[PDB]
Write a protein that binds this ligand. Structure first.
Ligand SMILES: Nc1nc2c(ncn2[C@@H]2O[C@H](COP(=O)(O)OP(=O)(O)O)[C@@H](O)[C@H]2O)c(=O)[nH]1
Ligand SMILES: O=S([O-])[O-]
Ligand SMILES: [Cl-]
Length: 337
């Protein structure tokens, strides 16, 4: 372990009466465009380092799971009208009407056997599936298929959200969330911000949704999501405040990216791309595109990881590697408390 050797060279604890018990602090700034996976990484730190989610905690997310599911099916059904896609079975038109009747009369996310039946039959329909497969043409929750394929379980009367159900939720974050966890005897203070108050943070973790490459901003249908993310990364990576800050890049949603890359060409995002349309070549190209935005290459190193933030095991592996980089490079700028 090169990290253990490196940290063992520190002598600053000796200057403190109870130095060996002192807390070494690491501040991590968590950045990235909306829906890039920041809240999910936050949830994973709780799961991995601070004892997960109990069942009662999971229970609080029940109506969030229903809400996300309701939103997803409605977005697809509504898109069918705008894209002129017919139901595969004309009998589904009644189910579609009933979806709006049921969502329309409720105060918040909910589930009944009646609604489940409605959504289940809609989700199985060939025309709905065809609309689903053109989701790049509208705005659809990335977790749509996850919840809709598991609808039968979610619809059971004594349904209890699993940890993965909770990780899969999309929750509207406003403002700054700060989380604390201890790992490898470091006391991490993680800020979900998505900025001069964080000058001289130990490290930045910047999240990018790989699967955004063929999508558009909800605000401006003309604006390519990935180009927006690059511009944001450019504006962060080359900012005065962050020269001694380790810049970590999470190229996230690699699972979703791998699934669509065969069907939908990278050229939609990068017209000049002439590589093959495979997971390997297209992901590499995106990595190179982002790392290129760094204007101080022989000064600043970018530490890139491909992540699936909903996958606890991958996030645990990636977190472990990122932490070794910080221990090897940044401890001299981390204070004791
Ligand atoms: N399949 C998949 N879904 C993800 C991944 N990362 C995040 N999500 C989902 O994408 C949605 C948005 O992620 P979120 O953490 O809320 O993004 P934020 O706006 O940056 O906080 C949530 O529904 C997550 O469950 C991933 O790597 N793979
Ligand atoms: O001194 S180091 O081990 O935090
Ligand atoms: Cl999403």
């Amino acid at each position: 372990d090169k990290a253990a050797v490196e940290r063992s060279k520190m002598i600053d604890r000796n200057l403190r009466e109870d130095g060996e018990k002192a807390a070494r602090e690491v501040k991590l700034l968590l950045l990235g465009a909306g829906e890039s996976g920041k809240s999910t990484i936050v949830k994973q730190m709780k799961i991995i380092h601070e004892a997960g989610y109990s069942e009662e905690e999971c229970k609080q997310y029940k109506a969030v799971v229903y809400s996300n599911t309701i939103q997803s099916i409605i977005a697809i059904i509504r898109a069918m009208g705008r894209l002129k896609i017919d139901f595969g079975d004309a009998a589904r038109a009644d189910d579609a009407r009933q979806l709006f009747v049921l969502a329309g009369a409720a105060e918040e996310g909910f589930m009944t056997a009646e609604l489940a039946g409605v959504i289940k039959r809609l989700w199985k329909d060939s025309g709905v599936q065809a609309c689903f497969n053109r989701s790049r043409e509208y705005q659809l929750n990335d977790s749509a298929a996850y919840y809709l394929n598991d609808l039968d379980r979610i619809a059971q009367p004594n349904y209890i959200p699993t940890q993965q159900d909770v990780l899969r939720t999309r929750v509207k974050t406003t403002g700054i969330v700060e989380t604390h966890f201890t790992f490898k005897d470091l006391h991490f203070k993680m800020f979900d911000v998505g900025i001069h108050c964080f000058e001289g943070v130990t490290a930045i973790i910047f999240c990018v949704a790989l699967s955004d490459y063929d999508l558009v901003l909800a605000e401006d249908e003309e604006m390519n999501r990935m180009h927006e993310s690059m511009k944001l990364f450019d504006s962060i990576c080359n900012n005065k405040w962050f020269t001694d800050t380790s810049i970590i890049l999470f190229l996230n949603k690699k699972d979703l990216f791998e699934e669509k890359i065969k069907k939908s060409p990278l050229t939609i995002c990068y017209p000049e791309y002439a590589g093959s349309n495979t997971y390997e070549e297209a992901a590499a190209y995106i990595q190179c595109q982002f790392e290129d935005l760094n204007k101080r290459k022989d000064t600043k190193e970018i530490y890139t990881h491909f992540t699936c933030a909903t996958d606890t095991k991958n996030v645990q592996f990636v977190c472990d590697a990122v932490t070794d980089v910080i221990i090897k490079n940044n401890l001299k700028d981390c204070g004791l408390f």
